[PDB]
């Protein structure tokens, strides 16, 4: 029974790692990262 507790409560750690990485994947680019993209690209249009 104690070995079972060891297994399932290590599984809770694996679940926290899996869902945290999925939360990092689905929102790969946030509102700040693309703001830099738009700001950097706006500088390219001043050559003409």
């Amino acid at each position: 029974d104690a070995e079972k507790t060891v297994l399932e409560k290590s599984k809770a750690g694996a679940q926290s790692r899996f869902d945290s990485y999925g939360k990092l994947y689905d929102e790969n680019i946030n509102a700040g990262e693309n703001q830099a993209m738009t700001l950097r690209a706006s500088a390219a249009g001043l050559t003409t």
Partner: protein
């Protein structure tokens, strides 16, 4: 365009009272500059008003 200046100016990790106050002051400066201008002349694109 000045609200787009505002958003990218205020978008950062650390926000403090002084930073947002200064950003609002710059935005208000832009708004005041674009509001004080006066019209000189105009043209009407169509034959009929």
């Amino acid at each position: 365009k000045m609200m787009d200046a505002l958003l990218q100016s205020v978008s950062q990790s650390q926000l403090n009272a002084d930073t947002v106050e200064d950003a609002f002051m710059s935005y208000l400066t832009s708004f005041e500059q674009v509001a004080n201008l006066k019209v000189i002349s105009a043209y009407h694109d169509n034959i009929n008003n």
